[PDB]
Nucleic acid binder design. Structure first.
Ligand SMILES: [K+]
Ligand SMILES: [Mn+2]
Ligand SMILES: [Mn+2]
Ligand SMILES: [Zn+2]
Lengths: 117, 341, 618
DNA sequence: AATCTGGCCTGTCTTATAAGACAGGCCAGAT
DNA sequence: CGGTTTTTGTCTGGCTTCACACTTGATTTGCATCACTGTG
DNA sequence: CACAGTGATGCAAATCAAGTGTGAAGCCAGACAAAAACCC
């Protein structure tokens, strides 16, 4: 984005407010009023010259039951948390290293007919 | 061996593969028409005479005491010496195989029109199962007549046959069948020499022996280059059959055989491989105890015959073969030739 | 800067223009609706729309606030494909384009439709036969089978010149029943019976078989097939259940002659006149059917096993096919009926009093009489004795009358009488071929002026339908000079139009009882009219179908209840699908055309798929 | 001289535009 | 060339909503592939 | 160098479904000022 003179004015006012009142949460509709009164010929010249530097900056910027692997994975999740993308990498490595997966596939075989019907 | 083109009459359609020709006193006759006999010719038998390279098929009639046999494709056919013909097996127009045996004999020959007698011979004992593509021949031993029947094909048996393969065929068991026409009995002999089933072979019969040439064995799918001699003894007791393999056998299935002179025959036609026709011809010279197979000069086949996939024919008898090859289709379905010797 | 249109502006910009009306609406919300602005704007918009007759937008917005997803089940998609005649390759274009413009996969892709198909095609549902079927395999996953059924094709054998595919007869019937399952349940319910009741059902099946000409041969490697096809089809006609000592009509086909319910069982490229190949291909079909006559099919519908018994009625055959498969002579013969032993001459003298004597059983006897010749007779005497049955039947048909072919051959006879009445043949016996040609020309031109009928080369169903009226006789009368013969024509057509509804309607007893009543009376005057005022054509001869129509119609009606529903017309209308499907719904190659048509012809006949199209009309 | 055959053809027949059945004329070759 | 009328934004802390994280074995889709079609 | 299909096949390719704190995006509030079109 590119910032107008009034907008730099408002930003600097927000900075002053934050340094004067650190624990203080500003209201927006009231702050726009008080900033608008402060804006409404020499104070503003600093912001006016700041705005063209921001314009140059804008120029630069312009240019179904689960798989047997799923059933195994879900149970081994708590142990890995004790030890998402990283968890699943670990889960897949250990599943690949493991008659080991015959019971999970029997559970999936019972669930396959239930999905079909 | 001079090859000659032949034209055919209006009922050219009758002629199909598996047809048979029979010879009675030089007059040739035709049997096994495609489709059931029509009111034009109820018997299904035709006087088959070629005059100046044009063949006219004219209906022949039966005697009052005749059976009206169905048209039969690939039956085993044999000549019996008073001259008569044996028809055993074959496929009917409905694709059934018939076990019945029919005898064809000239009943009357008044004014050069022939009446036939077609009688059914009942057969008891070890009757051969219904077959096509099998040979039957008559041997003479010690003043006795005996019929021999070997090889062929049939459908699966009723226990194993299933509609999904209803038309599947298998070679019969290669048992030699002695068949006495006088009594109507048939005797079966199992031999060690005849291990495989065999169909579409050639059979040549001299005195008490019948030679088995070529043929195709369905299980092996091989057209073996073997020759088998089968000798039958007719003593006062039960006859004995002995088989001998003789090397130097032709390798051909569905070959056609004609007799050029007494004791010499020519074997032409048929297939050496499923896609390879047998263009060569062989000469067989018989000895009382020996058989001679000699390469002879190939005929001047036309480019049609050379490149046809299939050809079929039968022997006309006077050392002349009647050949047929699939023709153009819209025209007439088959093209016919006559090869003389 | 002229004010742009409100829809063009950015969010920030439309906010500034409506911030005056926005603050006005927040008020209305807190005062009236408790500050639910979301609901009050949603309703103000939806109502604004329907105010401008824009119901579609409002209805969709309703469905998207409810948020229910839109999508068709594959089996729904299949029904739209099968029944709107779309090809997969056309359907794929629709599917693709719908998903890309709406972003949503309304239609399912093809692999899933191809999975929905699996239920509706033979081989999917399990069954069993008690007792087991003779010579049939008991596998239940047998879909499309090769129609040659292991026919031997080595070069030594008889030449194989056909391609064929088929379903195994039972496995087909099974998949037929399972299609009808929902319709069968309701048939018990509306008969006040137990849904779960499982007694011995009976399935009466109409069997049909025709030959087609002009089936172009594809290029490419394969058998050099002929340019003809044969079809064997079955229609499920009625299912009754035995509940007490009553036979309760659970189901009866509403449209017995519709392409829709005719089921393809066997497609071959072959010529019906080629007996050798016909029997080779169909004999496995007749054996499977023979087996099912002596077994009961136990099958499981909706969790409850039921039993079915089968009655097979071959009545969708034309006379030429009947005569071929039952060993009778062709139809020039003097043995003119396939229902009786009468002779052509005899049928011209007596006309009406003849009862149905032939049957598949008798012919089979007579062939064996023919072939064996037990009284050592002459061939004239032999043929007399076996009444012309001189070949071996191989298919069992009902001795009946095809209505379509009956309607056709009758109208073509009248078309001839019309000509011979124009030439006054009733008065002048002899006439030159050139004299006859102009009678036909006259009548042809006139049927165009008065009846809007263009001349056609072979006689039509619709032509016959529209020629055999009394308005047409009025037309034809303008051409004939003598009004003594305007009367004869008028009466002949009155008798025929009183008779016709008997042998064409589904239920004559309910639909023209008086015509069924008078049939034996009207058929006697028709026959007598032909015998007197039409001597010139009907002395000593009569047409095959005039005999069938004048002599056997009442008996057949009391034996079977109907003639018109056992007609081959449903089979014929299936041929129209054969042609369409072979072009537009099958892989275009010699080794796939027959199965792809068989399969996709079956789906078009699936009532379960058909129901989805009628779903709007609850 | 005759006759009765029996084959060939054309035509009209079912049914229905390509085939099969059948009748009847046509004439040569036997009784 | 100002005078004047509308688009479009800045400013800010914090409100929601969402897609993206990576892995594993299936399902579900997308798509080119084959040898032919018919209008001549 | 005709051209748009005719349906099944089988191999990419994409989507799925779960585990949950990441930043990114849009949003609200008042007041005012950039830009960007129009009235001699
Ligand atoms: K229709
Ligand atoms: Mn037909
Ligand atoms: Mn038809
Ligand atoms: Zn009748």
């Amino acid at each position: 984005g590119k910032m107008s003179s009034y907008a730099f004015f408002v930003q600097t006012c927000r900075e002053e407010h934050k340094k004067k009142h650190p624990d203080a949460s500003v209201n927006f509709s009231e702050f726009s009023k008080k900033c608008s009164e402060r804006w409404k010929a020499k104070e503003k010249g600093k912001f006016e010259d700041m705005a063209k530097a921001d314009k140059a900056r804008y120029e630069r910027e312009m240019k179904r039951p689960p798989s047997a692997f799923f059933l195994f994975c879900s149970e081994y999740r708590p142990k890995i948390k004790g030890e998402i993308g990283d968890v699943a990498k670990k889960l897949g490595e250990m599943w690949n290293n493991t008659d080991d997966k015959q019971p999970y596939e029997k559970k999936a075989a019972k669930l396959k007919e239930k999905y079909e019907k | 061996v001079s090859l000659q083109m032949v034209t055919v009459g209006h009922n050219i359609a009758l002629i199909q593969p598996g047809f048979s020709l029979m010879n009675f006193d030089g007059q040739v006759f035709f049997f096994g028409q495609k489709g059931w006999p029509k009111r034009s010719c109820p018997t299904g038998v035709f006087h088959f005479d070629i005059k100046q390279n044009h063949l006219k098929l004219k209906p022949a009639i039966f005697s009052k005491d005749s059976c009206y046999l169905p048209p039969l494709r690939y039956p085993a056919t044999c000549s019996y010496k008073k001259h008569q013909y044996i028809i055993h097996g074959g496929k009917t127009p409905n694709n059934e195989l018939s076990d019945k045996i029919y005898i064809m004999s000239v009943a009357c020959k008044n004014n050069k029109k022939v009446t036939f007698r077609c009688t059914e011979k009942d057969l008891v004992g070890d009757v051969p199962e219904p077959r096509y593509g099998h040979s039957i021949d008559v041997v003479y031993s010690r003043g006795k007549s005996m019929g021999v029947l070997f090889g062929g094909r049939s459908y699966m048996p009723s226990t194993q046959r299933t509609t999904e393969k209803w038309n599947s065929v298998a070679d019969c068991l290669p048992h030699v069948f002695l068949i006495d026409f006088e009594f109507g009995c048939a005797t079966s002999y199992i031999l060690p020499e005849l291990q495989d089933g065999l169909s579409f072979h050639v059979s040549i019969a001299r005195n008490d022996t019948v030679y088995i040439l070529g043929g195709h064995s369905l299980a092996s799918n091989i057209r073996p280059a073997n020759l088998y001699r089968i000798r039958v003894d007719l003593p006062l007791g039960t006859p004995a059959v002995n088989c001998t393999v003789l090397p130097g056998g032709i390798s051909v299935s569905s070959a056609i055989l004609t007799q050029t002179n007494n004791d010499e025959f020519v074997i032409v036609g048929g297939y050496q491989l499923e896609n390879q026709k047998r263009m060569v011809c062989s000469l067989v010279s018989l000895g009382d105890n020996t058989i001679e197979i000699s390469e002879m000069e190939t005929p001047d086949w036309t480019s049609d015959i050379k490149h046809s996939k299939i050809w079929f024919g039968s022997n006309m008898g006077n050392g002349t073969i009647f050949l047929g090859i699939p023709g153009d289709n819209k025209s007439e379905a088959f093209y016919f030739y006559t090869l003389r010797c | 800067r002229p004010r742009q249109h409100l829809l063009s502006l950015t969010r920030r910009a439309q906010k500034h223009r409506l911030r005056e009306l926005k603050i006005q609406v927040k008020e209305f919300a807190d005062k009236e609706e408790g500050g639910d602005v979301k609901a009050v704007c949603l309703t103000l918009f939806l109502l604004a729309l329907r105010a401008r007759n824009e119901h579609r937008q409002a209805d969709e917005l309703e469905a998207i606030m409810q948020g229910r997803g839109s999508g068709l089940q594959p089996a729904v998609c299949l029904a739209i494909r099968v029944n709107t005649f779309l090809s997969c390759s056309q359907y794929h274009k629709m599917y693709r384009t719908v998903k890309a413009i709406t972003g949503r996969q309304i239609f399912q892709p093809l692999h899933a439709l191809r999975n929905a198909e699996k239920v509706l095609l033979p081989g999917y549902h399990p069954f069993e036969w008690q007792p087991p079927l003779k010579n049939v395999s008991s596998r239940t996953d047998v879909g499309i089978i090769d129609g040659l059924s292991g026919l031997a094709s080595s070069v030594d054998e008889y030449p194989v010149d056909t391609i064929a595919k088929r379903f195994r007869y039972d496995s087909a019937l099974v998949s037929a029943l399972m299609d009808m399952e929902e319709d069968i349940l309701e048939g018990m319910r509306s008969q006040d019976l137990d849904d779960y009741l499982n007694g011995p059902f009976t399935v009466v099946v109409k069997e049909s078989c025709d030959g087609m000409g002009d089936v172009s041969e594809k290029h490419g490697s394969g058998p050099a097939v002929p340019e003809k096809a044969v079809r064997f089809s079955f229609t499920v006609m009625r299912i009754t259940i035995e509940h007490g000592s009553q036979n309760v009509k659970v189901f009866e086909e509403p449209k017995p002659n519709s392409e829709l319910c005719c089921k393809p069982l066997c497609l071959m490229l072959a010529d019906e006149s080629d007996h050798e190949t016909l029997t080779a291909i169909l004999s496995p079909l007749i054996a499977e059917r023979e087996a099912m006559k002596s077994s009961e099919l136990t099958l499981e519908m909706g969790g409850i096993p039921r039993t079915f018994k089968f009655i097979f009625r071959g009545t969708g055959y034309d006379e030429k096919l009947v005569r071929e498969v039952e060993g009778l002579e062709a139809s020039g013969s003097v043995y003119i009926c396939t229902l009786c032993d009468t002779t052509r001459l005899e049928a011209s003298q007596n006309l009406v009093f003849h009862s149905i004597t032939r049957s598949h059983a008798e012919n089979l006897q007579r062939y064996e009489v023919w072939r064996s010749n037990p009284y050592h007779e002459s061939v004239e005497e032999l043929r007399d004795r076996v009444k012309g049955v001189s070949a071996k039947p191989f298919i069992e048909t009902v001795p009946s009358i095809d209505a379509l072919h009956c309607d056709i051959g009758n109208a073509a006879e009248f078309y001839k009488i019309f000509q011979l009445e124009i030439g006054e043949v009733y008065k002048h016996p002899n006439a030159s071929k050139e004299e006859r040609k102009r009678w036909q020309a006259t009548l042809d031109k006139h049927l165009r002026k008065r009846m809007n009928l263009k001349p056609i080369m072979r006689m039509n169903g619709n032509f016959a339908r529209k020629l055999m009226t009394q308005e047409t006789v009025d037309a034809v009368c303008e051409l004939i000079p003598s009004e003594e013969r305007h009367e004869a024509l008028r009466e002949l057509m009155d008798l025929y139009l009183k008779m016709k509804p008997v042998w064409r309607s589904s239920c004559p007893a309910k639909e023209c009882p008086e015509s069924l009543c008078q049939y034996s009376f009207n058929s006697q005057r028709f026959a007598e009219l032909l015998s007197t005022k039409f001597k010139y054509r009907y002395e000593g001869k009569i047409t095959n179908y005039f005999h069938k129509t004048l002599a056997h119609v009442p008996e057949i009606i009391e034996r079977d209840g109907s003639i018109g529903a056992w007609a081959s017309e449903g089979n014929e209308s299936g041929n129209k699908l054969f042609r369409r499907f072979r072009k537009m719904n099958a892989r275009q190659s010699k080794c796939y055309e027959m199965e792809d048509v068989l399969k996709h012809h079956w789906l078009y006949t699936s009532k379960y798929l058909q129901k989805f199209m009628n779903a709007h009309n609850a």
